[PDB]
Symmetry: C2
């Protein structure tokens, strides 16, 4: 009956379903773990979202997302930090296993990528006490390098782990195959993450050939070229046995299909291709 | 009169100009270094291209390109290796400072990215004796990670340098800001390249915000977010003082403008923004 070890990031059916319907279809397929987004939670209301979570015994593999730290001035940086505190409060209410952090790109006008990265480290450090007090692990999600300028300037698992080592307890990593599959040093950095006890989440999807859009053409698992099986074996060998979270952005395919069929296909591909 | 230290990769005006006209406009602006592509050379003829090169005293900062090593079988891999030998012969005829190598993506159907990378190393090793005998340095060009699956599975300068160390003399790197600007370890790897005496080329352009296409929306220098000045200072500190090669693929902007204006703008932006 239950599909053990599978979570659905609700972006996967974001065009078709708001929060309650997404949960309903996931439960209809034996799925008891989700990762909602803050806008989806806000649209239903945080209190109702947590009631649904607690009533159905749902695990949250993550809440998406905090981050977005760099800004051209102190006021803007603190506005971002303070938003992350709200995100932590939301995650805590929902019992999320972590708050996913998407670092933010360059401050407007700036070319100073190293400074942007320092603002990320400082921003995480500013949020950490709030997160630790709330019992909410912070998961730095290294993002594909194509996102460096304008979405997230933490772009390798090695770099993410360097930040985890600098900041100390309460911060780990979310390993999303879309963002990291290409990294020539991926095997060593997964092993490193495991030694650090830093792995908080594992997101799955695929890299299509060709990829037709930089943001909204993620593949269903098995439709692309990622060695999903190999990555998962390495993550398990590193000591992480949590659910695999399906996170697909697909403007011209999966978002245009009935949510039922999408989730059915996620379960099939999870069984066969992961 | 002369614009010292500037080269134009002829992709920059590829829609507007074949080889002879491209050279003419570059010389009209005081530019005496180019990097043509093999298709452009073939369209005019290798003999005529070399005559033009020798008559005008042109430097070639590169010939684009060899590579494309991985294939599902030995016959296909050897076909690729043998093409690279032809590319070396072309580079030698034109007096090119290097042959740029774009590694190739995964063999069709395969998910085995590590094996693809082994085929790259083996392929370069197979070509090297031909290149060394011809006097043609091979320049491994790490490519942006977004190209990993289907164009080039050498995706970081560190990885490129690892291959250079494995293979030994006659192989170095082409450092293209588009492909490497995001790398969190870029400063250390540029310094490393310099210690290895491995830097063979420096390609310039910019990363736009937003980037509107994965292949054909490179920016004119200064229109994007790359710290061009900083990268160049590090390349010079590492011991490379060769020309900066402008390589812009811009389907909706620079390729639609008069070649004259494009090259004029390259010289202005080279002066101000590099
Ligand atoms: Zn993710
Ligand atoms: Zn290049």
């Amino acid at each position: 009956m239950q599909v053990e070890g599978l979570s659905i990031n609700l972006a996967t059916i974001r065009e078709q379903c708001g929060f309650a319907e997404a949960v309903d279809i996931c439960l209809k397929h034996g799925i008891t773990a989700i990762a909602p987004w803050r806008d989806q939670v806000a649209a239903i209301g945080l209190g109702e979202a947590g009631r649904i979570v607690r009533a159905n015994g749902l695990k949250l593999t993550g809440l998406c997302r905090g981050g977005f730290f760099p800004a051209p001035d102190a006021s803007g940086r603190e506005k971002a930090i303070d938003d992350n505190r709200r995100a932590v409060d939301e995650a805590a209410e929902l019992g999320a296993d972590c708050l996913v952090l998407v670092a933010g790109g360059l401050p407007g006008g700036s070319k100073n990528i190293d400074a942007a990265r320092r603002m990320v480290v400082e921003g995480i450090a500013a949020v950490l006490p709030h997160a630790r007090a709330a019992g909410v692990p912070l998961a730095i999600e290294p993002l594909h390098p194509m996102y460096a300028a304008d979405r997230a300037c933490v772009n390798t698992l090695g770099q993410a782990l360097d930040i985890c080592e600098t900041l100390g307890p309460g911060v780990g990593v979310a390993i999303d195959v879309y963002h990291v599959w290409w990294d020539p040093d991926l095997a060593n950095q997964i092993a490193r993450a495991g030694k650090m006890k830093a792995i908080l989440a594992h997101h799955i999807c695929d890299w299509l050939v060709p990829t037709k859009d930089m943001l909204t053409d993620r593949g269903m698992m098995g439709d692309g070229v990622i060695d999903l099986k190999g990555i998962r074996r390495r993550i398990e060998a590193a000591g992480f046995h949590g659910a695999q979270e399906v996170e697909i952005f697909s403007a011209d395919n999966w978002w245009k299909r009935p949510a039922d069929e999408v989730i059915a296909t996620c379960v099939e591909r999870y069984r066969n291709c992961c």
